[PDB]
Amino acid sequence: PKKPTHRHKLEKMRALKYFKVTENDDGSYKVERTRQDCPHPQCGAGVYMAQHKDRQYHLT
RNA sequence: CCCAUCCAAUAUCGAGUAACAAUUGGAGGACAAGUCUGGUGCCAGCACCCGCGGUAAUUCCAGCUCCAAAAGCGUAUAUUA
RNA sequence: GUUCGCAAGAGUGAAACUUAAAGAAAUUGACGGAAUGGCACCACAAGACGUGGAGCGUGCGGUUUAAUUGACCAACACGGGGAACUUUACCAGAUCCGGACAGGAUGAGGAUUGACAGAUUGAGUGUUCUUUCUCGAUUCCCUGAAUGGUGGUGCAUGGCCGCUUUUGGUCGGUGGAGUGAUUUGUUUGGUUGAUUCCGUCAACGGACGAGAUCCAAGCUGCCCAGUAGAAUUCAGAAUUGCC
RNA sequence: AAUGCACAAGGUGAAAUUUUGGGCAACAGCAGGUCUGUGAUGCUCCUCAAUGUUCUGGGCGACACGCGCACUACAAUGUCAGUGAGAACAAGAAAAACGAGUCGAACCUACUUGAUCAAAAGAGUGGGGAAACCCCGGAAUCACAUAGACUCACUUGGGACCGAGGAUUGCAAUUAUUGGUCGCGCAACGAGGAAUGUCUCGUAGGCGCAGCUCAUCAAACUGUGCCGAUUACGUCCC
RNA sequence: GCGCGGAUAGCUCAGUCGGUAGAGCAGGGGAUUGAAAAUCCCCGUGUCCUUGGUUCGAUUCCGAGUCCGCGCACCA
RNA sequence: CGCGGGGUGGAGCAGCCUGGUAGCUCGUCGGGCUCAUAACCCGAAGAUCGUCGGUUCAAAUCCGGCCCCCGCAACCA
RNA sequence: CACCAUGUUCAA
Numbered sequence: 001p002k003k004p005t006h007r008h009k010l011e012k013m014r015a016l017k018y019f020k021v022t023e024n025d026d027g028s029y030k031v032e033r034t035r036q037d038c039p040h041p042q043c044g045a046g047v048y049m050a051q052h053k054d055r056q057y058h059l060t
Numbered sequence: 061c062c063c064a065u066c067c068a069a070u071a072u073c074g075a076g077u078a079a080c081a082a083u084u085g086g087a088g089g090a091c092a093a094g095u096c097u098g099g100u101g102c103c104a105g106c107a108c109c110c111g112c113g114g115u116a117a118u119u120c121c122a123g124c125u126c127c128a129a130a131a132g133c134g135u136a137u138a139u140u141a
Numbered sequence: 142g143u144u145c146g147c148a149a150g151a152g153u154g155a156a157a158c159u160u161a162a163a164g165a166a167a168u169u170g171a172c173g174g175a176a177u178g179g180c181a182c183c184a185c186a187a188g189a190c191g192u193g194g195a196g197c198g199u200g201c202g203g204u205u206u207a208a209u210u211g212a213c214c215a216a217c218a219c220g221g222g223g224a225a226c227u228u229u230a231c232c233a234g235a236u237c238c239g240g241a242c243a244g245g246a247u248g249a250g251g252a253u254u255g256a257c258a259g260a261u262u263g264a265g266u267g268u269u270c271u272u273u274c275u276c277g278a279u280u281c282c283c284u285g286a287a288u289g290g291u292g293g294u295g296c297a298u299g300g301c302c303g304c305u306u307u308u309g310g311u312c313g314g315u316g317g318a319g320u321g322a323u324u325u326g327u328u329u330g331g332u333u334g335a336u337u338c339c340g341u342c343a344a345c346g347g348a349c350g351a352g353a354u355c356c357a358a359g360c361u362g363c364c365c366a367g368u369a370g371a372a373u374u375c376a377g378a379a380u381u382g383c384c
Numbered sequence: 385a386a387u388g389c390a391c392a393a394g395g396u397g398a399a400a401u402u403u404u405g406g407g408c409a410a411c412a413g414c415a416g417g418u419c420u421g422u423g424a425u426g427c428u429c430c431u432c433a434a435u436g437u438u439c440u441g442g443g444c445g446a447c448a449c450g451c452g453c454a455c456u457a458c459a460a461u462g463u464c465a466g467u468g469a470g471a472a473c474a475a476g477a478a479a480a481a482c483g484a485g486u487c488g489a490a491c492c493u494a495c496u497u498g499a500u501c502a503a504a505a506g507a508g509u510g511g512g513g514a515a516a517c518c519c520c521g522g523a524a525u526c527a528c529a530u531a532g533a534c535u536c537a538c539u540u541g542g543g544a545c546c547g548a549g550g551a552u553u554g555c556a557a558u559u560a561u562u563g564g565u566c567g568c569g570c571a572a573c574g575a576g577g578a579a580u581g582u583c584u585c586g587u588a589g590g591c592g593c594a595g596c597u598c599a600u601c602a603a604a605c606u607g608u609g610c611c612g613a614u615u616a617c618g619u620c621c622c
Numbered sequence: 623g624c625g626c627g628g629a630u631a632g633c634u635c636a637g638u639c640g641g642u643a644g645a646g647c648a649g650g651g652g653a654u655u656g657a658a659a660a661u662c663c664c665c666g667u668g669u670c671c672u673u674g675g676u677u678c679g680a681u682u683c684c685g686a687g688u689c690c691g692c693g694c695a696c697c698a
Numbered sequence: 699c700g701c702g703g704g705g706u707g708g709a710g711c712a713g714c715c716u717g718g719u720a721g722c723u724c725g726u727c728g729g730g731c732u733c734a735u736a737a738c739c740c741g742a743a744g745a746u747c748g749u750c751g752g753u754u755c756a757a758a759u760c761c762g763g764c765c766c767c768c769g770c771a772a773c774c775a
Numbered sequence: 776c777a778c779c780a781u782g783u784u785c786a787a
């Protein structure tokens with residue numbers, strides 16, 4: 001009765017996925033991450049999980 | 061009036077898209093000249109005669125391009141060959 | 142209109158209008174409820190075994206249906222068509238691009254690909270809406286196009302098939318005949334399934350088809366076999382009679 | 385017959401007149417069929433909610449009816465239940481995949497089993513690349529002094545229709561895929577009107593069997609064998 | 623003049639004696655054809671004079687009244 | 699109106715048992731023959747006997763009342 | 776010598 005939309009992928013506006021605080025980086029620390037990977041399924045290296053009500057996400 | 065003569069005889073206006081612009085009938089045959097493109101689909105129309113047109117029209121309605129005569133060229137009725 | 146006639150009629154004799162041929166003689170063909178000679182169990186004869194009647198299978202028509210997707214002797218168990226899905230061409234929906242490549246505007250500060258859970262849905266189908274991560278130039282958005290179609294037209298075609306036709310038929314060359322289309326060769330006679338042969342012959346020389354070649358079956362030679370078979374001779378076993 | 389080309393009858397022979405049976409077949413043509421065979425094709429239509437292409441579900445198969453073509457019968461020259469003898473053509477498994485450049489499994493099959501108890505199955509174990517295994521290919525008609533049941537009836541003829549278990553093919557069986565079991569059989573049908581088809585000897589007819597379609601399904605078709613006649617060997621009547 | 627009678631699609635026309643409408647052609651589209659004609663299917667469709675008395679409602683009943691036909695008349 | 703005749707399958711007509719899915723010709727259907735149609739051949743269907751009553755075991759017939767159709771007459775001053 | 780009638784319009 002009504003035509004569907006034929007979805008295009010949404011732009012994330014200058015961030016696909018993101019890190020943590022204290023961008024000074026005075027030789028003490030690497031920056032922390034904001035999600036996890038749960039590896040070997042399938043890659044786990046740069047695979048970062050979704051929030052989705054803090055649940056999960058690929059796949060892995 | 062026209063035509064003719066003239067743009068100095070000391071001394072006369074003027075072409076450019078020379079826009080100051082050719083048309084009238086045709087392109088199957090007789091009969092000179094398109095197996096071009098678009099439209100219509102035995103309709104609309106053409107065709108003196110033969111014939112064209114029934115969804116790929118050498119013939120209709122048009123655009124292009126050609127042919128013929130040309131300040132002319134079609135058509136009709138008489139009339140001679 | 143007039144002159145003849147007892148009358149039927151006769152003689153004389155137009156036009157308006159209409160039409161693109163009507164005719165004439167020949168040729169080639171097709172056709173005859175026209176002669177003549179042949180042939181064929183897709184003809185009959187003399188017969189066989191059936192179909193048409195019945196029940197079912199299957200194809201065709203019609204009627205239904207959302208839809209029930211060529212052909213009318215030479216269509217109808219045929220399109221190798223005995224389709225549950227697929228096939229598939231039809232109907233109700235749903236995806237995907239398999240719209241290459243160009244040109245123009247977004248574009249890495251992201252063009253875009255894909256998807257878990259829910260809602261949507263016929264669908265534990267991300268198709269889409271919410272959600273956020275992945276993909277990392279492959280794409281996407283416009284414009285121009287192109288490639289796909291078991292879309293149409295077999296009356297635009299190629300190819301193949303069927304059918305004219307199970308018939309013996311067609312064609313040149315050069316000569317003859319006629320203004321010519323066209324004839325002759327290619328024939329009246331016998332003959333064969335056969336323009337097959339013999340003879341005749343204004344024809345003579347050729348080409349194809351027919352025959353030949355090819356396959357299969359029947360008899361047969363050579364070759365041949367621990368992928369075919371046979372006999373024998375010793376051993377082993379079985380019957381062994383009075384019924 | 386009258387030269388010739390040849391013909392009939394008989395011989396010879398395995399075979400006697402195209403030996404038999406097929407294949408192949410000229411020239412012209414049909415406005416035959418095929419655009420549903422092709423990456424055969426011109427033109428023209430559709431071309432992103434597409435007439436493309438894929439899913440999902442239907443349909444092609446739906447039945448007052450009319451027709452082609454088969455199949456099964458209407459029975460005693462038979463149906464049944466036994467038992468015997470005994471054919472030919474034929475088919476048969478796999479990929480640059482998944483497994484252990486070599487080998488396996490997909491295909492057909494015998495044999496055992498299932499079996500101190502129905503078929504249909506389901507399982508083992510062999511073999512076969514096919515003249516080598518199936519296979520001494522145990523086809524069905526037929527046969528039988530079978531001292532077998534029926535005895536002329538819509539009947540033990542016929543098996544349409546459909547009811548209930550069950551098991552296999554498939555990813556899926558409902559508008560039963562197919563087999564098997566017990567019911568139903570009171571469904572016509574007793575040899576078929578007008579009409580009509582094919583056929584001249586290993587033929588017609590009967591009989592089955594392979595292959596092909598095929599995961600599952602032959603009343604089909606292409607082949608093959610088996611049993612095996614009636615009539616004509618004529619004519620132009622249609 | 624009186625009486626008998628008939629009006630329903632663009633036209634033509636059948637009606638259950640007093641419960642609501644039939645076709646067909648003409649029309650618009652398909653199937654068919656080489657295009658047509660025929661042919662078949664599907665579609666637009668008739669407030670029935672005017673109305674009253676109103677059977678649950680007048681087309682179907684009866685009587686009034688446009689329409690258009692038919693039976694029958696000074697007196698010797 | 700008097701009087702007289704008839705209503706029968708879609709058409710035209712018959713019908714003497716008081717009675718045959720009532721009969722006839724044509725038509726309508728279904729199949730054949732034909733390339734196709736007609737002719738022709740083989741089949742099958744179709745009747746509120748106009749209607750209501752009554753006689754009867756039984757009615758198209760028999761007796762009626764009605765509705766129609768069709769005439770014969772409808773006289774002499 | 777029984778009966779044996781007919782096949783729409785253009786076009787190819």
Ligand SMILES: NC[C@@H]1O[C@H](O[C@H]2[C@@H](O)[C@H](O[C@@H]3[C@@H](O)[C@H](N)C[C@H](N)[C@H]3O[C@H]3O[C@H](CO)[C@@H](O)[C@H](O)[C@H]3N)O[C@@H]2CO)[C@H](N)[C@@H](O)[C@@H]1O
Pocket residue numbers: 181307308334335
């Ligand atoms: N290519 C052979 C052709 O045979 C034709 O002739 C054939 C016909 O005369 C005739 O054929 C007939 C046929 O007409 C008819 N319609 C059916 C008949 N069965 C045939 O018969 C022929 O074939 C069968 C083989 O099955 C045999 O019974 C018979 O011996 C044979 N004469 O027999 C000949 C076949 O041998 C023509 N001569 C010719 O078209 C051609 O040569």
Ligand SMILES: [Mg+2]
Pocket residue numbers: 117
């Ligand atoms: Mg044109």
Ligand SMILES: [Mg+2]
Pocket residue numbers: none
């Ligand atoms: Mg022009």
Ligand SMILES: [Mg+2]
Pocket residue numbers: none
């Ligand atoms: Mg059908």
Ligand SMILES: [Mg+2]
Pocket residue numbers: none
């Ligand atoms: Mg010459």
Ligand SMILES: [Mg+2]
Pocket residue numbers: 577
């Ligand atoms: Mg009969």
Ligand SMILES: [Mg+2]
Pocket residue numbers: none
């Ligand atoms: Mg006539």
